[PDB]
Ligand binder design. Structure first.
Ligand SMILES: c1cc(-c2csnn2)ccn1
Ligand SMILES: [Ca+2]
Ligand SMILES: [Ca+2]
Ligand SMILES: [Zn+2]
Ligand SMILES: [Zn+2]
Length: 167
């Protein structure tokens, strides 16, 4: 037999993702780079592997959309809601949606796509919000320039997947 696990998490270390569409605000290459790096944040501290698919069904489907976009979490136009992702689970589990009425950047302007994606993918992997204001998973976006995953987030993700190679 098998009972349900303690926490929502992926039962496999190999995860796929697909960028289903692209924001007008950035080039395809900038978007792809920001998401690659956002995934690397998590894979660097776990045994998780992330492979990109160009078509088909992925564990983590990534899309930009506005207003009603095919779920119970419709966006609100410019300002307010920003992005959201679903915990691991069947179908839409793992998926990450970005509001294309916000402005997305690879700078300190607007919302940095890398930082928000890194936060969203934490949700895609099984992390909820942290109370640590310095943590990546703190609910409120702040821009940081340098990237070092804060220890609250390292401990959180490793509680789910282990550390993988510690050096
Ligand atoms: C997107 C990004 C964030 C975030 C980045 S750093 N700390 N929180 C929170 C909510 N939505
Ligand atoms: Ca999915
Ligand atoms: Ca919005
Ligand atoms: Zn959505
Ligand atoms: Zn969040």
């Amino acid at each position: 037999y098998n009972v349900f696990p303690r926490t929502l998490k992926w039962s496999k270390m190999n995860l796929t993702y697909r960028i289903v569409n692209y924001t007008p605000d950035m080039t395809h290459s900038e978007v792809e780079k920001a998401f690659k790096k956002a995934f690397k944040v998590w894979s660097d501290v776990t045994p998780l592997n992330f492979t990109r698919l160009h078509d088909g069904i992925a564990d983590i489907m990534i899309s930009f959309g506005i207003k009603e976009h095919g779920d119970f979490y419709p966006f609100d136009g410019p300002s307010g809601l920003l992005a959201h992702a679903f915990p691991p689970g069947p179908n839409y589990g793992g998926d990450a949606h970005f509001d294309d009425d916000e402005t997305w950047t690879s700078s300190s302007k607007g919302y940095n796509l890398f930082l928000v994606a890194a936060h969203e993918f934490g949700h895609s992997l099984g992390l909820d919000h942290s109370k640590d204001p310095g943590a990546l998973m703190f609910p409120i976006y702040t821009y940081t320039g340098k990237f070092m995953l804060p220890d609250d987030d390292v401990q959180g993700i490793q509680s789910l997947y282990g550390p993988g190679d510690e050096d």
